[PDB]
Amino acid sequence: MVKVKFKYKGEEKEVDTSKIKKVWRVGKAVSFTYDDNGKTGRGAVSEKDAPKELLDMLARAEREKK
DNA sequence: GCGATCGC
DNA sequence: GCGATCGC
After folding, report:
1. Where N6-methyllysine occurs, residue numbers?
2. Domain A1-66 has what CATH class?
């Protein structure tokens, strides 16, 4: 499958892109929210660390219209 | 500070 | 409403 590896307040997680909910660019980073077993988690990676799948999801988000 | 959110 | 949070 495709997991994104990231750090958040220490906890170095690696979430299934299928659990990613929203993705957006903040500066040169790719930020996102994800389903964290019911809660909404937050993560961000540098673009070089972002697997293509996440960048595909980002491009999809970037094409969204009103 | 940028986006966007959570968690308070 | 905003600090923390991520990368930078």
Report:
1. 5, 7
2. mainly beta
